[PDB]
Design a binder for this molecule. Structure first.
Ligand SMILES: CCCCCCCCCCC(CCCCCCCCCC)(CO[C@@H]1O[C@H](CO)[C@@H](O[C@H]2O[C@H](CO)[C@@H](O)[C@H](O)[C@H]2O)[C@H](O)[C@H]1O)CO[C@@H]1O[C@H](CO)[C@@H](O[C@H]2O[C@H](CO)[C@@H](O)[C@H](O)[C@H]2O)[C@H](O)[C@H]1O
Ligand SMILES: CCCCCCCCCCC(CCCCCCCCCC)(CO[C@@H]1O[C@H](CO)[C@@H](O[C@H]2O[C@H](CO)[C@@H](O)[C@H](O)[C@H]2O)[C@H](O)[C@H]1O)CO[C@@H]1O[C@H](CO)[C@@H](O[C@H]2O[C@H](CO)[C@@H](O)[C@H](O)[C@H]2O)[C@H](O)[C@H]1O
Ligand SMILES: CCCCCCCC/C=C\CCCCCCCC(=O)O[C@@H](COC(=O)CCCCCCCCCCCCCCC)COP(=O)([O-])OCC[N+](C)(C)C
Ligand SMILES: CC(C)[C@@H](C)/C=C/[C@@H](C)[C@H]1CC[C@H]2C3=CC=C4C[C@@H](O)CC[C@]4(C)[C@H]3CC[C@]12C
Ligand SMILES: CC(C)[C@@H](C)/C=C/[C@@H](C)[C@H]1CC[C@H]2C3=CC=C4C[C@@H](O)CC[C@]4(C)[C@H]3CC[C@]12C
Ligand SMILES: CC(C)[C@@H](C)/C=C/[C@@H](C)[C@H]1CC[C@H]2C3=CC=C4C[C@@H](O)CC[C@]4(C)[C@H]3CC[C@]12C
Ligand SMILES: CC(C)[C@@H](C)/C=C/[C@@H](C)[C@H]1CC[C@H]2C3=CC=C4C[C@@H](O)CC[C@]4(C)[C@H]3CC[C@]12C
Ligand SMILES: CC(C)[C@@H](C)/C=C/[C@@H](C)[C@H]1CC[C@H]2C3=CC=C4C[C@@H](O)CC[C@]4(C)[C@H]3CC[C@]12C
Ligand SMILES: CC(C)[C@@H](C)/C=C/[C@@H](C)[C@H]1CC[C@H]2C3=CC=C4C[C@@H](O)CC[C@]4(C)[C@H]3CC[C@]12C
Ligand SMILES: CC(C)[C@@H](C)/C=C/[C@@H](C)[C@H]1CC[C@H]2C3=CC=C4C[C@@H](O)CC[C@]4(C)[C@H]3CC[C@]12C
Ligand SMILES: CC(C)[C@@H](C)/C=C/[C@@H](C)[C@H]1CC[C@H]2C3=CC=C4C[C@@H](O)CC[C@]4(C)[C@H]3CC[C@]12C
Ligand SMILES: CC(C)[C@@H](C)/C=C/[C@@H](C)[C@H]1CC[C@H]2C3=CC=C4C[C@@H](O)CC[C@]4(C)[C@H]3CC[C@]12C
Ligand SMILES: CC(C)[C@@H](C)/C=C/[C@@H](C)[C@H]1CC[C@H]2C3=CC=C4C[C@@H](O)CC[C@]4(C)[C@H]3CC[C@]12C
Ligand SMILES: CC(C)[C@@H](C)/C=C/[C@@H](C)[C@H]1CC[C@H]2C3=CC=C4C[C@@H](O)CC[C@]4(C)[C@H]3CC[C@]12C
Ligand SMILES: *[C@@H]1O[C@H](CO)[C@@H](O[C@@H]2O[C@H](CO)[C@@H](O)[C@H](O)[C@H]2NC(C)=O)[C@H](O)[C@H]1NC(C)=O
Length: 1489
């Protein structure tokens, strides 16, 4: 009688409740009779409302519970309905944008409408507030896809409310037919969404094939209701408009709207780089425009005439062109953005106004610069002062354009591109959070710009002066003379600057990591965590930290002895670990709190485990739990997390209700005996993996078996094996520790309740379970429970008997009501307490009909949305089906729900006339609280973990993921779990929540567990557009460098490696042919260069040292946050494992598949770069080039060094056998992406080739020009021509007739590698650049050919064949070189065992059973392993012979092949006996040609 039995005791048992359940029920019933809601959906939402009303009034008064629920749903500043109303109903979106900007920089009007709205809300009676929330929930509970479009539902709510309040409805006598709201209103909107993606093909539904710019999605549908212009587009069937009807007559005609003639695309996606320019224009302005000024200032030789350090007016006016560059990036950004947006919507007339202001600013920068340059008398103060002034106009332009957001440019004079309410409403940072965001980004760019000047630019001052002034003394080609080879130093310079332009971008990410690592270690030190202390200090203080931070002991109870309560909670944790078979009996006893007889007889005493004492008493080093154990992990994280700031909890009865929502489609529920016991079966594979867990399991099995002394025993092995594998049972069993934790806390903190029962221990467990049923709900969404196979159906029924309180929501098809129509779909809810019908299926508690099949998109989010109407409580924890939790973490739930900042706060009237928006303290609610996750059994994955504390403080966390909790009333009123309209990562998934004003938090003291499993389409999303062009700079820099700046960093690293190869092949080609001066160290600029006539290119060659260091640091800096994170928690040695797991990540898979899986990914590019790297080292050797050898050897030889059983003799040559069988058997967006980049690379190699044959420094005349351009044509087209020539034999004449053509292509391609080698007169260095050029030239030839035939018909299939013969030889020759490289190590005896020991010693040593072959097949194995062994040794004898052939052919004293040709073919073979050292004391005949 002292403990109420009613379902909602905090409301019903309180006498201060303004309205009873009877009145609240009559309101829900009246609304259903009036608007035709489903009766079963009304019962669901009536139950949902009462739980919200009972979880709220659990911690406040019932009057404040109803008032705060009305504010959060209808009329508060946190209500999405108030935001939509002030934007779409009152045209006040621009006023909201003005005050957002004014409030963001802090640490008839809008104000009159706000005061008028608060006074209308304040006069509502409690019954009117119930009717408002009930109407919204009833509309929300039958929306089922309009839940994804929040603002479409606000419009439907207002149409329904206006109709409801009218005499047209109050005077109506008959009720609306049941299901009328869904049939007439919701279903047509669903049919629009479905017909955008699906088509009817003779009766079924199959996806349409359309680009994403033809599909009107959820966002394009939602945004119509953001503006009064959009609502003015809603048109009825008869032709009229919806807004032409009185307010109360519009709901009744929402079924006559032709939604196809209304909805339209609001944001079209385009080419990826067009979005990067607009969305991240502030990133390009600073790097691109500061780079210009850095290099214009440090390159006086580009504007000095007849090179003279004076005449500074030219130096200042040349830097001042960085303001013209910044003003031009903004023009291009505005032009790109003008193509994403429809031309008459939401703004975009302000886009044309902005373009003209940016054209004025750009003219102001350009104009006076033209005056300075073109009106100078070759020290004119009329131009020396202009140049100085225009340098600061340039600087001020750069600062303005890289600070101020693009969308908020010139908006002070529809002024915004998108509505502010829903797109530009980010929560500002205040106080210490704000100053840390400033300090991070000031430090990142003060350190970046400081050392990018001294190391990237000042080091280049002499290379720029030298390479831009020297002219080569070459002879050149026959076709153009010496006009291309005398500008080679300038071509080398232009490539060097372009390579340093990309290093300018890699530099910023280098400093983002360095600064964030220091700030994430100084934050831990300041917060007191500061983990360098031994674990003895962490564990000794644990007993006191359990009393404070877990036990809610702020003295409601009368000061019980703390040791009693800690023991009751510490022991339950350990017993939980012991029943999980993680602790042995000798471990547990040393860890428990033990009752001991007192000094006084007939008494008991509590004493702490030595674990809490022996750590302090370090005389001994006993083991309480095993090394590297899971109990070692969980206890060490538990004690470590309780050393951090944790909010103090509420009593359990004051706790909010929450829900765990889990989507399930096809995952395994339980392991069945078939798949555990029948190359090693599952059950015996687990014993090998979890040995000590199993023996403790059987040891308990022995006790249980001998207790009864099998169906009981066969189950506990299915359960034991399921709890070690990724199953749904393991997740459900792990997250029912919330029910166990809530019961334990309720019992430990309420001794009076327990003592009240006093021996009625069975009746107490009813009381503890009644409370845990009230505060925790587990909801699993089983999408296909209606189509479960009987073994799966039996698995699900086992869940509902082990856990009666678990609820399962499922889709329930139903025959069509009339023949030749669509089946009816329902959402149904069952649980363990449901009556079990005759057919073995439980009768559903609720059964709500949908408009149609809800699964229209990418799966998970549609599943979560159908089951979302059955969630209860204030918070939802999203959970994935392959997770699990622990009791010691589930004990911290009351302090994780306190991160939403609604539990221990005062309640004020949200409609009080005194307050103004600016002084309200609840304007930005916490939307998401994220938590750490443990992966049991990547760069950015563990980048975020170390930075998560700093990124959450400065607003940089946008994670709508699976391990985290959400504010249910905030999120479900604003679109829900996701959008279901695209393989988006969850790293940036809740930014709709952040765009709409919610904050996203991160707690470091909670950690669940989860099992493991190009730019992307993320860059084309509108959320990047809204975030990029509207965030303030400090918060834009955190947004860019967290997710998208990481993906661009990877791209820039690759581009920087391909531009170094093009630069190196030209810088080594220039150093090979030049006599370079002795590089005197510590010498002035105009000092004497020792060999008179030399080239001073040693400074330019040393640039390779500096670039190599830069890209070496850039590689190894991505590991610093990885090592520091593990070094600071594990402490000494586990950093090494994560360092090597990260580094290594970067039967026997055959070469036929392993090579083909990485051929177009790393092998092809890395084999072309290795040829270019090979030329670089032989042409001019430098030590730093070794790192590019190691980094390219690994890139190619990684997949073939970790393949198990790759390196043994016998299996090696059998893999070659199937490799050969694989070879024979089997019978403007493209141009601007990889066609021009492919031509530039061929041109850059062509320049390097022709210069190395330019005879630099040979005393020649006009007829000593070589025709090295012809050598390219002869060695590029001729192998292609003969590839086509044989295909005309096949048509003139299917493996024998094809392998002859396949064999011919290999022969000719190798033959012309030999033809080039002799055209260069047997010069190995000149051949390498010759062959590289031809490979790149054929790639360009096919690349333009492929796009030409893939935008005649008989050749449209022929061209794809000649492209393939040359392609085939590329695979044949490249494949063997990988194989031939395996030769020196297979001949090492005992290499397979030697290699495979570390293949399993460093990793867990998984064992595959050694195969046993027939003694008849073995005789065939011996033959065939020695059959193709004699072929691999012969292809190696042909590949080798092609190398020692021309190499030995140097014994050709006779002058050179073809001494008597004349004309376009004279000197087709490079001359010899020519010494290109024309430097020295000789000063006559300066003219080498
Ligand atoms: C060596 C390294 C280089 C140093 C960089 C030097 C550049 C200096 C930038 C100065 C700066 C960025 C600071 C962030 C540092 C990040 C550095 C990263 C470097 C980038 C590579 C600080 O901005 C000022 O800082 C003040 C202090 O916090 C604060 O003033 C407040 O507190 C005072 C005290 O209580 C108090 O007196 C005062 O009343 C308060 O108002 C305000 O934020 C602001 O006045 C400017 O930021 C911009 O300021 C704009 C108007 O404010 C702001 O509004 C603009 O955009 C909106 C949309 O259209 C819209 O509002 C408008 O269109 C437009 O007006 C922008 O949103 C914002 O982005
Ligand atoms: C103000 C900003 C300035 C910043 C500096 C800008 C430098 C950026 C240059 C990058 C660039 C321009 C080259 C020059 C073009 C002409 C310009 C005129 C030149 C002067 C006259 C060439 O660089 C790219 O780099 C790739 C990596 O090396 C490489 O791809 C090669 O390596 C791979 C792994 O090794 C491997 O797949 C394979 O070996 C190759 O594919 C190619 O070389 C090339 O695609 C183009 O970048 C690319 O553009 C793509 C679509 O726009 C974009 O793809 C996205 O959209 C696609 C649509 O459907 C979609 O299909 C993609 O899924 C999607 O991801 C790429 O993300 C982006 O990379
Ligand atoms: C000692 C002297 C050595 C020189 C030997 C030279 C003799 C060679 C003689 C003949 C071989 C020439 C055949 C290829 C000709 C056509 C080129 C071609 O098809 O490119 C293709 C790949 O193919 C390559 O990239 C070739 C790479 C070089 C490997 C060949 C030599 C390997 C030796 C060096 C090994 C490392 C050396 C380091 C030290 C060992 C490009 O295909 P794709 O464009 O990526 O297709 C993508 C699909 N898409 C278009 C739709 C996107
Ligand atoms: C970053 C952009 C906006 C502009 C400011 C960059 C300017 C750089 C390239 C140039 C312009 C003014 C230069 C100037 C400032 C101070 C002097 C001292 C003088 O004895 C030698 C040159 C030296 C050391 C240079 C350093 C680099 C500067 C700062
Ligand atoms: C990738 C970018 C940075 C490349 C294309 C730019 C290179 C420019 C900045 C550099 C490379 C070589 C330089 C070049 C070398 C010498 C000459 C001749 C002189 O009478 C005027 C300056 C002039 C014409 C300059 C102009 C600027 C040049 C062209
Ligand atoms: C990134 C750096 C390396 C590049 C962009 C530097 C570019 C500037 C320094 C160079 C490139 C083109 C040059 C430009 C082209 C032609 C003229 C006219 C001549 O009578 C004097 C030099 C003068 C006036 C120079 C001025 C300086 C310029 C603008
Ligand atoms: C938004 C950015 C683009 C705005 C604020 C511009 C910042 C520039 C002007 C400022 C920020 C940091 C400054 C930087 C830091 C330290 C020195 C070292 C000195 O030997 C050369 C100039 C140099 C390298 C200056 C150049 C000017 C810089 C680069
Ligand atoms: C990379 C290639 C495509 C570039 C360098 C080719 C340029 C050639 C085709 C063009 C550019 C300017 C022309 C030109 C300038 C100087 C040369 C060398 C001289 O003795 C005869 C005239 C001659 C031959 C002519 C004809 C062809 C030239 C050299
Ligand atoms: C990114 C790389 C691939 C591209 C940009 C390389 C560009 C450099 C090599 C090329 C592009 C424009 C060229 C440039 C334009 C015209 C003149 C002709 C002559 O008077 C000197 C060489 C000079 C000055 C050359 C030097 C080399 C340049 C600068
Ligand atoms: C005026 C110059 C100095 C400033 C604006 C810099 C311009 C370059 C660095 C930037 C601005 C515009 C960019 C450009 C616009 C659109 C795409 C198409 C895509 O398929 C390849 C990359 C590409 C072609 C990129 C390449 C890099 C560009 C050309
Ligand atoms: C001020 C800007 C415009 C100047 C300095 C820089 C231009 C660079 C960034 C742009 C222009 C030309 C581009 C270039 C042309 C061809 C090569 C090799 C190809 O296989 C991949 C793309 C790649 C690697 C890209 C890299 C980025 C480049 C080099
Ligand atoms: C990576 C590739 C794309 C870069 C390096 C090549 C750029 C070529 C197209 C550019 C850079 C150097 C230029 C070259 C340098 C000097 C002049 C002399 C003039 O009388 C004719 C044009 C001519 C001969 C031009 C022709 C075009 C060239 C060769
Ligand atoms: C792998 C096979 C196909 C190798 C052996 C092919 C070799 C032939 C195709 C190539 C290799 C080098 C070539 C050889 C080098 C230089 C000369 C001198 C010239 O005045 C006539 C052609 C001649 C004599 C050619 C003939 C064809 C040869 C011999
Ligand atoms: C196994 C095969 C692929 C090996 C042996 C091929 C070797 C050929 C291609 C190599 C080795 C010896 C070379 C040979 C020896 C000397 C002469 C000089 C001149 O008179 C023409 C080229 C010529 C004839 C070259 C051509 C290329 C040859 C013939
Ligand atoms: C190219 O020829 C010049 C001139 O014969 C050589 O220059 C000599 O280099 C040595 C090396 O220190 C100096 O001691 C001599 O004083 C230089 N001679 C003159 C006249 O300056 C140069 O070494 C040669 N380069 C080669 C052979 O690679």
């Amino acid at each position: 009688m002292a403990l109420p039995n009613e379902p909602y005791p905090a409301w019903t048992a309180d006498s201060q409740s303004p309205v009873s359940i009877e009145q609240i029920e009559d309101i829900f019933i009246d609304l259903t009779n009036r608007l035709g809601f489903q009766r079963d959906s009304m019962r669901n939402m009536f139950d949902h409302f009462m739980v919200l009303l009972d979880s709220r009034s659990s911690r406040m008064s019932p009057d404040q519970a109803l008032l705060s629920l009305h504010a959060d749903y209808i009329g508060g500043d946190t209500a999405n309905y108030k935001k939509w109303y002030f934007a779409a109903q009152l045209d006040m979106d621009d006023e909201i944008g003005f005050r957002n900007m004014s409030l963001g920089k802090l640490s008839n009007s809008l104000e009159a409408a706000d005061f008028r709205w608060k006074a209308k809300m304040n006069q509502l009676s409690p019954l009117e507030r119930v009717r408002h929330i009930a109407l919204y929930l009833l509309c929300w509970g039958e929306a089922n896809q309009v839940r994804f479009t929040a603002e479409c539902l606000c419009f439907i709510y207002k149409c329904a409310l206006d109709y409801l309040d009218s005499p047209l409805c109050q005077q109506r006598q008959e009720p609306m037919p049941e299901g009328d709201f869904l049939n007439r209103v919701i279903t047509p909107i669903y049919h629009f969404i479905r017909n955008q993606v699906y088509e009817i093909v003779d009766g079924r539904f199959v996806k349409r094939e359309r680009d994403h710019n033809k599909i009107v999605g959820y966002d394009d549908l939602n945004q119509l209701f953001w503006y009064p212009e959009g609502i003015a587009k809603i048109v009825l069937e008869d032709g009229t408009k919806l807004i032409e009807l009185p307010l109360e007559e519009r709901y009744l005609r929402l079924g006559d709207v032709v939604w196809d003639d209304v909805f339209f695309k609001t944001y079209k996606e385009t080419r990826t780089w067009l979005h990067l320019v607009t969305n991240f224009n502030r990133i390009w302005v600073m790097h691109i425009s500061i780079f210009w000024m850095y290099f214009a200032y440090n390159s006086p030789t580009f504007y000095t005439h007849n090179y003279n350090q004076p005449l500074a007016a030219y130096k200042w006016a040349s830097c001042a062109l960085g303001g013209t560059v910044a003003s031009l990036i903004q023009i291009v950004a505005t032009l790109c953005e003008w193509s994403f947006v429809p031309r008459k919507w939401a703004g975009a007339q302000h886009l044309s106004r902005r373009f003209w202001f940016l054209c004025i600013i750009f003219g102001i920068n350009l104009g006076p610069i033209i005056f300075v340059f073109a009106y100078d008398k070759d020290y004119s103060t009329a131009a020396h002062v202009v140049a100085a002034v225009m340098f600061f106009v340039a600087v001020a332009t750069i600062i303005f354009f890289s600070i101020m957001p693009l969308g908020g440019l010139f908006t002070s004079y529809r002024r915004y591109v998108a509505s502010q309410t829903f797109t530009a409403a980010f929560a500002p940072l205040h106080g210490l959070d704000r100053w840390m965001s400033y300090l991070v980004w000031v430090t990142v760019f003060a350190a970046k710009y400081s050392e990018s000047y001294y190391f990237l630019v000042l080091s280049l001052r002499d290379p720029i002066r030298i390479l831009s002034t020297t002219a080569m003394r070459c002879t050149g080609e026959y076709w153009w003379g010496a006009v291309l080879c005398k500008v080679q130093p300038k071509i080398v310079l232009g490539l060097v600057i372009a390579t340093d332009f990309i290093l300018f971008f890699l530099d910023t990410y280098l400093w983002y990591i360095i600064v964030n690592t220091i700030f994430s270690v100084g934050k831990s030190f300041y917060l007191g965590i500061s983990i360098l202390t031994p674990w003895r200090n962490i564990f000794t203080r644990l007993p006191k930290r359990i009393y404070s931070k877990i036990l809610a002991t702020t003295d409601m109870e009368i000061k019980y002895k703390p040791k009693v309560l800690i023991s009751q909670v510490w022991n339950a944790i350990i017993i939980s670990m012991y029943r999980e078979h993680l602790l042995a009996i000798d471990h547990v006893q040393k860890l428990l709190y033990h009752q001991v007889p007192s000094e006084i007889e007939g008494k008991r005493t509590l004493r702490a485990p030595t674990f809490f004492v022996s750590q302090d008493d370090n005389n001994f080093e006993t083991e309480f739990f095993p090394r590297d154990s899971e109990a070692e992990r969980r206890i060490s994280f538990f004690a470590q997390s309780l050393s951090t700031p944790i909010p103090e909890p509420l009593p359990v009865d004051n706790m909010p209700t929450f829900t765990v929502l889990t989507p399930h489609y096809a995952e395994r529920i339980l392991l069945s005996l078939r798949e555990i016991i029948r190359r090693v079966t599952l059950l015996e594979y687990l014993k090998q993996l979890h040995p000590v867990e199993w023996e403790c399991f059987v040891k308990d099995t022995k006790i249980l078996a001998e207790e009864t002394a099998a169906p009981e025993y066969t189950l506990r092995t299915r359960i034991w094996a399921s709890l070690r594998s990724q199953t749904l049972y393991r997740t459900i069993s792990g997250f029912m520790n919330y029910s166990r934790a809530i019961k334990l806390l309720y019992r430990v903190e309420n001794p009076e309740i327990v003592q009240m029962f006093g021996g009625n221990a069975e009746g107490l467990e009813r009381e503890l379970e009644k409370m845990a049923r009230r505060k925790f709900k587990f909801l699993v969404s089983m999408q296909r429970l209606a189509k479960f196979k009987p073994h799966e159906l039996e698995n699900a029924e086992f869940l509902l008997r082990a856990y009666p309180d678990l609820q399962i929501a499922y889709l329930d098809e139903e025959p069509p009501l009339t023949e030749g129509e669509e089946p009816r779909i329902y959402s149904a809810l069952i649980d363990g307490h449901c009556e079990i019908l005759d057919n073995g299926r439980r009768r559903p508690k609720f059964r709500v009909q949908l408009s149609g099949n809800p699964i229209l998109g990418d799966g998970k989010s549609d599943n979560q949305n159908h089951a979302l109407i059955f969630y209860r409580g204030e918070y939802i924890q999203l959970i994935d089906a392959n997770q699990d939790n622990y009791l010691e973490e589930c004990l911290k739930i009351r302090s994780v729900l306190a991160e939403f900042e609604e539990l221990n706060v005062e309640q004020v009237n949200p409609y009080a006339p005194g307050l103004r928006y600016e002084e309200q303290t609840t304007n930005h609610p916490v939307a998401i609280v994220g938590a750490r996750e443990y992966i049991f059994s990547g760069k950015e994955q563990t980048f975020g973990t170390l930075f998560a504390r700093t990124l959450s403080q400065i607003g940089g966390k946008l994670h709508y993921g699976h391990p985290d909790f959400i504010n249910a009333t905030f999120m479900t009123t604003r679109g829900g779990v996701s959008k279901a309209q695209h393989l988006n990562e969850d790293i940036y998934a809740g930014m709709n929540a952040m765009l709409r004003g919610g904050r996203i938090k991160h707690c470091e003291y909670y950690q669940c567990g989860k099992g493991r499993d190009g730019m992307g389409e993320q860059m084309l999303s509108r959320e990047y557009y809204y975030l990029g062009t509207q965030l303030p700079v400090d918060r834009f820099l955190t947004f860019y460098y967290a997710h998208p700046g990481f993906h661009l960093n990877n791209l820039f690293i690759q581009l920087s490696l391909q531009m170094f190869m093009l630069t190196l092949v030209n810088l080594s080609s220039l150093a090979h042919e030049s006599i370079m001066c002795i590089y005197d160290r510590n010498k002035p600029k105009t000092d004497v260069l020792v060999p008179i006539g030399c080239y001073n290119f040693q400074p330019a060659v040393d640039w390779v040292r500096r670039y190599t260091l830069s890209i070496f640091i850039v590689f190894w800096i991505a590991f610093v946050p990885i090592v520091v994170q593990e070094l600071i928690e594990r402490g000494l040695w586990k950093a090494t494992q994560r360092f090597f797991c990260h580094l290594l990540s970067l039967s026997r898979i055959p070469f036929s598949i392993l090579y083909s899986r990485f051929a177009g990914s790393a092998i092809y590019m890395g084999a072309r770069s290795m040829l270019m790297l090979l030329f670089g080292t032989v042409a001019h050797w430098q030590a730093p080039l070794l790192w590019f050898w190691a980094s390219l050897s690994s890139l190619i030889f990684a997949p073939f060094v970790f393949n198990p059983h790759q390196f043994a003799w016998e299996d090696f040559f059998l893999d070659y056998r199937d490799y050969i069988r694989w070879l024979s058997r089997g019978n403007t967006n493209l141009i601007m992406a990889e066609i021009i980049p492919c031509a530039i690379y061929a041109a850059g190699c062509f320049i390097a080739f022709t210069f190395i044959n330019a005879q630099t420094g040979v005393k020649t005349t006009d007829d000593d020009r070589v025709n090295s351009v012809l050598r390219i044509i002869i060695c590029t087209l001729a192998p292609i021509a003969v590839n086509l020539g044989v295909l005309f034999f096949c048509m003139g004449m299917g493996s024998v007739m094809a392998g002859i053509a396949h064999g011919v292509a290999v022969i000719v391609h190798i033959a012309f590698f030999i033809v080039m080698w002799v055209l260069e007169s047997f010069n190995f260095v000149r051949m390498l650049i010759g062959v590289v050029t031809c490979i790149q030239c054929q790639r360009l030839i096919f690349h333009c050919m492929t796009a030409l035939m893939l935008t005649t018909q008989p050749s449209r299939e022929l061209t794809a064949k000649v492209i393939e013969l040359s392609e085939f030889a590329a695979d044949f020759v490249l494949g063997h070189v990988i194989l031939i490289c395996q030769l020196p190590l297979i001949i090492i005896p005992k290499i397979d065992k030697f290699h495979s020991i570390m293949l399993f010693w460093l990793k867990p040593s998984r064992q595959i059973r050694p195969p046993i072959y027939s003694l008849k097949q073995t005789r065939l194995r011996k033959r065939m392993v020695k059959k193709y062994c004699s072929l691999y040794f012969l292809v190696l004898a042909i590949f080798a012979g092609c190398i020692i052939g021309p190499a030995v052919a140097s014994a050709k004293i006779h002058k050179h092949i073809g001494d008597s040709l004349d004309g376009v073919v004279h000197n087709l073979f490079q001359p010899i006996n020519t010494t290109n050292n024309d430097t020295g004391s000789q000063m006559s005949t300066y003219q080498s040609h």
